[PDB]
Design an enzyme around this catalytic site. Structure first.
Site, PDB file in Angstrom:
ATOM      1  N   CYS A 158      -4.980 -20.456 -70.332  1.00  0.00           N
ATOM      2  CA  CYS A 158      -5.644 -20.131 -69.062  1.00  0.00           C
ATOM      3  C   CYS A 158      -6.106 -21.322 -68.260  1.00  0.00           C
ATOM      4  O   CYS A 158      -6.298 -21.188 -67.048  1.00  0.00           O
ATOM      5  CB  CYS A 158      -6.782 -19.130 -69.252  1.00  0.00           C
ATOM      6  N   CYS A 177      -8.698 -19.600 -66.092  1.00  0.00           N
ATOM      7  CA  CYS A 177      -9.988 -20.179 -66.463  1.00  0.00           C
ATOM      8  C   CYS A 177     -10.044 -21.662 -66.072  1.00  0.00           C
ATOM      9  O   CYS A 177      -9.026 -22.239 -65.723  1.00  0.00           O
ATOM     10  CB  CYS A 177     -10.259 -19.967 -67.960  1.00  0.00           C
TER      11      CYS A 177
END
Ligand SMILES: COCCO[C@H]1CC[C@H](Nc2cc(=O)n(C)c3ccc(-c4cnn([C@@H]5O[C@H](COP(=O)(O)OP(=O)(O)OC[C@H]6O[C@@H](n7cnc8c(N)ncnc87)[C@H](O)[C@@H]6O)[C@@H](O)[C@H]5O)c4)cc23)CC1
Length: 241
Positions: free
Chosen positions: A74, A156
């Site tokens: 991520c 992320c």
């Protein structure tokens, strides 16, 4: 009577192509040994065959999404809008950034069109609904809306987005990036969205991070409680190196 849509019909050999891309993806990625490509095809076909092609839902693709999990780290995601080739050329050079096309579902469906019809198993090779002229909830557009929303939700750390600085509208709120991805970045996982505005044309150089569409993207991201950063990539070939 035959119903006719405005868009091009299903890509010829769509079933064979999807199956072949699934097999190629599993042969090149070791983490895909548990993937049965016949099951992936049956889940894909099941999402849209026998259904009216203007009444497709994100739920119709849930079986396919369960078989085609996302594994990219991520913290290494690159989003993009209207600068596909340069974005993918950059990832091949960095080897530590990934786009949606690096996932099984992104790889399976790229550059393909597909649709079916109510109550039969027939794939429509003559025409398919155009998102703009016919209906937004068609099999293709719904697929990309669902997969890009899942891709953005998983992101992320610092998410990067490459944009084409030579376009009249650098950030287009109507694109997949503008209408789906930006709205699904999670503030508890994503600290910053960093835009890389590529000066890949012959335009007179200027600070494109000051463009009104970039200020609009900054406003959308700021309201989600995520930091916005923008960089001008004045020399794209130098940035690659
Ligand atoms: C909230 O509802 C209201 C909004 O609705 C959404 C709107 C988006 C729509 N997208 C697509 C519809 C669809 O019919 N096709 C066939 C799609 C084919 C692929 C993808 C595609 C692949 N990668 N991605 C992720 O999104 C970012 C990149 O997408 P963009 O920012 O759109 O960049 P662009 O360079 O402009 O386009 C990328 C490609 O897609 C086509 N496309 C784009 N928009 C449309 C559209 N409205 N109708 C028809 N085709 C569209 C366009 O022609 C080009 O081939 C990256 O960060 C990738 O991670 C998305 C998207 C679509 C879905 C519905």
């Amino acid at each position: 009577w035959r119903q006719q849509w405005s868009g091009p019909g299903t890509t010829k050999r769509f079933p064979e192509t999807v199956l072949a891309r699934c097999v190629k993806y599993t042969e090149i990625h070791p983490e895909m040994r548990h993937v049965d490509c016949q099951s992936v095809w049956d889940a894909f076909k099941g999402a849209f065959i026998s259904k009216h092609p203007c009444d497709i839902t994100e739920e119709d693709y849930q079986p396919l999404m369960k078989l085609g999990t996302q594994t990219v780290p991520c913290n290494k995601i690159l989003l993009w809008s209207r600068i596909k080739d340069l974005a993918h050329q950059f990832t091949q050079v960095q080897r530590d950034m990934f786009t949606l096309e690096d996932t099984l579902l992104g790889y399976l469906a790229d550059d393909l069109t597909w649709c079916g019809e109510f109550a039969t198993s027939k794939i429509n090779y003559q025409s398919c609904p155009d998102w703009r002229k016919d209906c937004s909830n068609n099999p293709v557009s719904v697929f990309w809306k669902t997969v890009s929303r899942r891709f953005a939700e998983a992101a992320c750390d610092v998410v990067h987005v490459m944009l084409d600085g030579s376009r009249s509208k650098i950030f287009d709120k109507d694109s997949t990036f503008g209408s789906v991805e930006v709205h699904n970045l999670q503030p508890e996982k994503v600290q910053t969205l960093e835009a890389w505005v590529i000066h890949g044309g012959r335009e007179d150089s200027r600070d494109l991070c000051q463009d009104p569409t970039i200020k609009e993207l900054e406003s959308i991201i700021s309201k989600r409680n995520i930091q916005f950063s923008c960089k001008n990539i004045y020399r794209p070939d130098k940035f690659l190196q």
